[PDB]
Design a binder for this molecule. Structure first.
Ligand SMILES: N#C[C@H](O)c1ccccc1Cl
Ligand SMILES: N#C[C@H](O)c1ccccc1Cl
Ligand SMILES: N#C[C@H](O)c1ccccc1Cl
Ligand SMILES: N#C[C@H](O)c1ccccc1Cl
Ligand SMILES: N#C[C@H](O)c1ccccc1Cl
Ligand SMILES: N#C[C@H](O)c1ccccc1Cl
Lengths: 162, 162, 164, 162
């Protein structure tokens, strides 16, 4: 019921995320991540630190964050444009089931939730995702968590991009 | 000698491209693909057509194109914002060698080259890439082909994105 | 250097007289194909206009698109399409009007962080160095890859310099 | 009473016409210039001949004519689309009074009036315009001269254009 107290499941291996690509966010907190597709990328061959990268794609705009594993099943995201760091966790993951992939992740401002991202590739049918969203919405600031896919731009022949 | 007569090698399996991710374009024709990172994405689980997607990323800007195989070792790209189609070929591919990946790809305007993209993840050291560029530069419009990675924006903690 | 449309420069809108003294201009770079082969003429408000909105005329042969405009906050102009009633909020990336080498500017309207339309006008055959740097910057924002040179393969004139 | 004998007042300086912009035609002869707004444009900076241009605007359509001074207080118009020439005169002008601007202009087919255009930006209140029209109507073919602004298309937020 406070953000610091939410579940922290192990971060799955990178290949599980790459196999899930692409995902879309069904629920988010700030309207930044509305109408958004997530793609995970392995580190560049010549990258010395070997950090993987999350791509958050909204139409023709992309947000990029390198990420590396931290303590307490955290990931630390490095905004590629800004240099800003955030500590993220998974509330749960459920990748590459026979009904597809879902997960919900979050980052905190102490006991409040600063950002929330629930991703899937199965149109929101995972029963885990339903229960996770209910829990998150009761954490302080969680009232802003909303369905992210309601009035999105029309497509021009691509399924996952517009 | 003319664009319509350039080599057209078989398109590698999608897995070989995804294993190469991310790449950058070392040589391009127009200014569009300067300072750009390419990421290949598989089709969304629920996509009926199962077209894969090419992501061309330059800072906060992304250009997206679904692609499918066509005749004569072609790929037909569908621009995801416009629905415009372009027929592309590979001049050569050399993916996932012990020295990394490279390829050069092109699209024609009759006998002229309209666009050219040479990708790698090994800082331009594949000897195939140098010979391919020297050939393409001699095709009509090919004089515009240029090194694409001078004076690109500075990074903020990520190796492959900015 | 600025990475999204919402972050582009917003210079002060010059007095309308500076635009009218620049008439007519042509668009060298645009985003959609609507404003290819296009000449711009600025018109003061009609004497009897209730709101004193000036008008931008975008002329392409025998066709015209018209937008009333008025000043808004943050150096914006709010445009009112006279045919449709559609409104849009425009800014100037830069203006360089009435120099000893003529006039140029680049203006834009955003769809949030993407550029929705772009219009680089001049009357000096695209020689202003500001215009080159501006175009390069605007192309790099989301959707800016569509910005193109607008004056290739336009219809032949019949004896008028600026209209066809 | 004959078109060739109508008054031919001096063509005012272009600046006086530009200061009057925009005008509308209250009376015209043919159907062509019903529901029409007139805007005058100076020559382009790079025009070698330095001819100004009259813009006749009717919704989304425009007729354009460069014009230059000729003998007898004439203007010679050059249609920018068709190349057609016509010799025009002013019956009177009354630009930039404290009650706004009006004028009446004409072109002849010998003794007949071929086209007539009375412009104003004061809703037709200049007494000169009334007397001019009554005179022109008595010229051969002047029976066709009519009020031009009756059943005009509805507007969408602009005063002078639709
Ligand atoms: N598979 C799947 C989802 O339907 C989807 C739709 C649009 C964009 C991305 C995704 Cl994953
Ligand atoms: N590996 C590698 C390359 O150096 C590189 C640098 C920057 C962006 C992408 C790539 Cl592939
Ligand atoms: N459309 C358009 C113009 O080029 C413009 C840009 C910015 C402010 C006003 C105007 Cl009319
Ligand atoms: N002055 C000038 C330009 O060359 C020009 C050519 C054609 C139409 C308009 C303009 Cl401004
Ligand atoms: N109204 C009118 C005429 O067509 C005209 C246009 C420009 C200059 C002179 C004249 Cl008479
Ligand atoms: N001022 C004035 C006139 O009433 C007018 C109305 C509509 C279009 C143009 C003009 Cl000048």
């Amino acid at each position: 019921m406070t953000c610091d107290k939410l579940p922290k499941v192990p971060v799955p291996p990178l290949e599980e995320f790459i196999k899930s690509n692409p995902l879309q966010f069904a629920y988010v907190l700030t309207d930044t991540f509305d109408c958004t597709t997530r793609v995970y990328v392995q580190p560049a061959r010549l990258s010395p630190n070997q950090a993987a990268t999350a791509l958050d794609i909204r139409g023709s705009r992309i947000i990029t964050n390198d990420f590396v594993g931290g303590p307490n099943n955290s990931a630390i995201l490095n905004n590629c444009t800004t240099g800003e760091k955030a500590t993220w966790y998974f509330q749960y993951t459920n990748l590459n089931t026979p009904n597809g992939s879902s997960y919900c992740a979050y980052t905190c401002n102490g006991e409040e939730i600063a950002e929330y991202k629930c991703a899937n590739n199965n149109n929101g049918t995972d029963p885990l995702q339903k229960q996770a969203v209910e829990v998150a919405k009761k954490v302080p600031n969680g009232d802003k968590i909303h369905y992210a896919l309601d009035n999105c731009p029309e497509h021009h022949g691509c399924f996952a991009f517009y």
